[PDB]
């Protein structure tokens, strides 16, 4: 069978086994927290240029395209994450704009692979634009040729606020979600104020949010989990007693906390009927739910319906003991972070992002500056260089005489030599001079941004406010003590 | 009314006859086959690349024109692959085409073909405005009504017409014999029919036969009417047991072996010579082994004359020998094919000369502008520095020297690489070369015999490239 | 598909041209093995085409014809089939019958819509 005798290669293959199973499935990353397959989806959708501006497209074709541009990995988790980042209700924020059959929230994952027709959302335009941006190393695949980026850089801790699902690999962890607006607020307060305290930002930060809209009670678990990320908290559904025209009372729920089925709990209600461990209950009904979710339990008189609500949030699954585990990974090794340290690593990432983008733009401007330096030096002593080309013979003689007379490089001399008559009007000569000084002003501006670091902070805050303007984030949940 | 009905009769009869009856004198190439070769040249894919297996070619053909069947277009393809029927050669192909056997190759697109070697030089000079064009009914692409030629294929491949008024037999001939006939009529406008007997000893076949007559050939090349003998080859050899064995290789043309053999079996089996149960007619993939053995107490020659009376081993092959030119049919003789091909090639060469003068004098005008630019430069530079517009620069150049608009703008098309003096001498050298070639073409245009010499040049080109002998062994 | 019923709207949906035939060609012609009709050859003169349509049936006598504007005009007006079979079989078993006694067998020239016919002098002229 095995007959493998060398324990050393067993240990080495076992370390690669463990770390590769880590790297494969979902991890608390530095910059996106995502699966690498998510990164694959995003980078393929970007570099194919499939915008939401353009119309919809059959997406299983795109799935096979990305699968063929990448490794021959299995289709299952691919199509799973394809659905998951198109599910509007599960992830708090919108990524993939599907068009087909999914199942709403009640245990029917419709998997119509033929009908896989979709687009994306407009938030990847805020997520990543690294076309020219020297940011991230690449790994090569098909006989080691074609790029794949290591990480997903951004200007945005959105995926902090999204939430994570990486549990069964080694030890368990997740990321519970918040909303974005007060996140922007507390972040900018740390930006302009690098020496703030936790609880004063808890004054800025409400509870961990949920897309359905949850009733939150208690803050001791909030105190523990904003610090150390461990503990379960209690969650209740928006549930009311309503009187009829007859005086009969009605238990009316609006939503539920996270990871709840209507139908499994409904079967559990029918159990509780036939289990004969709860009384009073008459009608278990649910209709018209697509204009708005409306599930109604209706109970006879002389029953103490609020005590029955107490019995619901004691024994039924309507009560939620929602636990946290945010056990981080920063450059491979597992860690654990406070809410400050997350944003700190975000800050220094934005530092490196804007610095490297500015240096790429710097080298753009420097190269074009050397171009226009050569142009203006050609404009200096024109007829002498006319005599030069009327005299000399070769590339070597021309470059030697131009370097002796004007101290320029070879490419500069040849770009001089590539000047035609139709770029010899004094109009375009002074337009060269004008755009030359424009780029000089841009170089000086970027050097001034290199002088002081806080301009980066200010521009980040500006475009955070732009995103919060285009993406107003009202609340949906409710916190109590 | 009835005059308009007569107009419809005349015009529609012209449509049908020019459609599917005899082609022009100028090409000898039927317009179906003409468009086959034109679209296969406009495939562009060389015969050097391996020849294709597709009906996409014929789909573009049917997009070029709607017939009463593209299966007939494929029939035209296959009948131009019939080397055993139509001579050398118009198809570079691979697929099933059979022989003169009764073969049915239903695999239509499954055959391979592309351009052929003779077609390559046969249809050059499209890029020289030599031949006129007409638009299709589809109003999108054009087509030529005639073709340029490098030989009278009229004589190379014959004609087997249909009787719309009457059909037409035209026999094939030989390559180099036709070349010698061209040279003969070129050197002498005073040739005779015996001269034609010299440079053409006789019409030949891709298979071979025997033509015993002489004056039928004489009336064929003079009157255009007459019938000949087509005879099978006969070889009388000795069986080891004493039988006058008959070996046959050649045959009359358009004569399958199969039904002839069946009628021979019938004539045996109708109370006649029945002891000839010896018909060894096989192994014909090396050649033709059509061997019988005459029975004992019977001579071979009587059975030979009886099968000549069966009109299949000896056949009166007639000739109608008609043609189409200037919208009319015509009874044929030589100095008509001959002078027609001569003056057609005159048209082609002279119009090619005119087009080459067009290109050469246009480029000469360019290099005029180039050398006049390279005379004096820096003053033009400094006056350009006193300007800000290419229209102003054009007006400045018109004030400076005599140029064209194209010349002025091409002088504006000068980077700094253009500012040397060696390339001045190079442009001057090619300028004098081009002036010398223009004067050469003008002197050739003031030379009638030089055209004939160019015709001799192309004849010697195709003669060094190819030749063919008389495979059809003819005794008279 | 789409045709238009009888009121001047010839629907010509060439894309929608989806069809079958009727079961009467099984009575019309079965010449597979049947040495009946010469053939003419087309694409470089190879493939068959029959000269005529033989049958066992004068059905197309009873159908009707439309050949008018070519030279002079002619048609074939239709009958029905049953009394046609009757009068034909009477001529078969009786080769020496008269016209009007078969007009006793043959009603007027028929029409598919169902027409009111008056008069028989034109019937006398046109059957002759």
Numbering used by the authors:
A (entry chain B): 6 to 486
B (entry chain A): 11 to 486
C (entry chain D): 105 to 232
Paste lines from the article.
DNA gyrases are type IIA topoisomerases found in bacteria, archaea, and some eukaryotes (plants [Evans-Roberts et al., 2016] and plasmodial parasites [Dar et al., 2007]) and are capable of relaxing positive supercoils and introducing negative supercoils into DNA as well as performing other topological manipulations. Unlike eukaryotic type IIA enzymes, which are large homodimers, gyrase is an A2B2 heterotetramer formed by two GyrA and two GyrB subunits. The GyrA dimer forms two gates that facilitate DNA passage. Here we present two different oligomeric structures of Streptococcus pneumoniae GyrA-ΔCTD forming an open dimer complex with a 44 bp unbroken DNA oligonucleotide.
